[PDB]
Write a protein that binds this ligand. Structure first.
Ligand SMILES: O=S(=O)(O)c1cc2c(O)c(c1)Cc1cc(S(=O)(=O)O)cc(c1O)Cc1cc(S(=O)(=O)O)cc(c1O)Cc1cc(S(=O)(=O)O)cc(c1O)C2
Ligand code: HEC
Length: 108
């Protein structure tokens, strides 16, 4: 996939409805069902401090960027077979661009 910067405003609403139940974004924010996402961009998969990941999420062995994030969020278990993230994915390209535009700001 090829990320294109979109609307963080639309992305924020998508995060609220699709992601917030399992994830926080703020620095020092708590783990929930899923890990806190602060600092996710640039970091090795499966490496937030204090969170117990699947071996699949750890050993995916990629650094997160906007393009592999878009691919992941299209269909999480297809990109990371073995994942325990129970999210079906955002099939729509604009949704992923907007979400990721938001995530870049919100987890900085
Ligand atoms: O910046 S905005 O988010 O306000 C914006 C709103 C509209 C827009 O048409 C665009 C931006 C331009 C635009 C950008 C992109 S992107 O490169 O992926 O960022 C894609 C499109 C687009 O028109 C094409 C498009 C895709 C989809 S998808 O099926 O979800 O992938 C839906 C739409 C698209 O126009 C419809 C649409 C939704 C929305 S929504 O408010 O975000 O739901 C605003 C506008 C729309 O035309 C009206
Ligand atoms: C129902 C729960 C749930 C939902 C909904 C969910 N997630 Fe997750 N997410 C998780 C869990 C659990 C993990 C850890 C999975 C593992 O260890 O295999 C995870 C992992 C991730 C990771 C990898 C983190 C890392 O450090 O490698 C990212 C990125 C992520 N989620 C983003 C999102 C985004 C963005 C959304 C919404 C679009 C979302 N998630 C929706 C539960 C969820």
């Amino acid at each position: 996939t090829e990320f294109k910067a979109g609307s963080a405003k639309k992305g924020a609403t998508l995060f609220k409805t699709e992601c917030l139940q399992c994830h926080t974004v703020e620095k020092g924010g708590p783990h929930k069902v899923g890990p806190n996402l602060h600092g996710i961009f640039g970091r090795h998969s499966g490496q937030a401090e204090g969170y117990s990941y699947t071996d699949a999420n750890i050993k995916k062995n990629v650094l997160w960027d906007e393009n592999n994030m878009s691919e992941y969020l299209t269909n999480p278990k297809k990109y990371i077979p073995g994942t325990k993230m129970a999210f079906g994915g955002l099939k729509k390209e604009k949704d992923r661009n907007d979400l990721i535009t938001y995530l870049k700001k919100a987890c900085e």
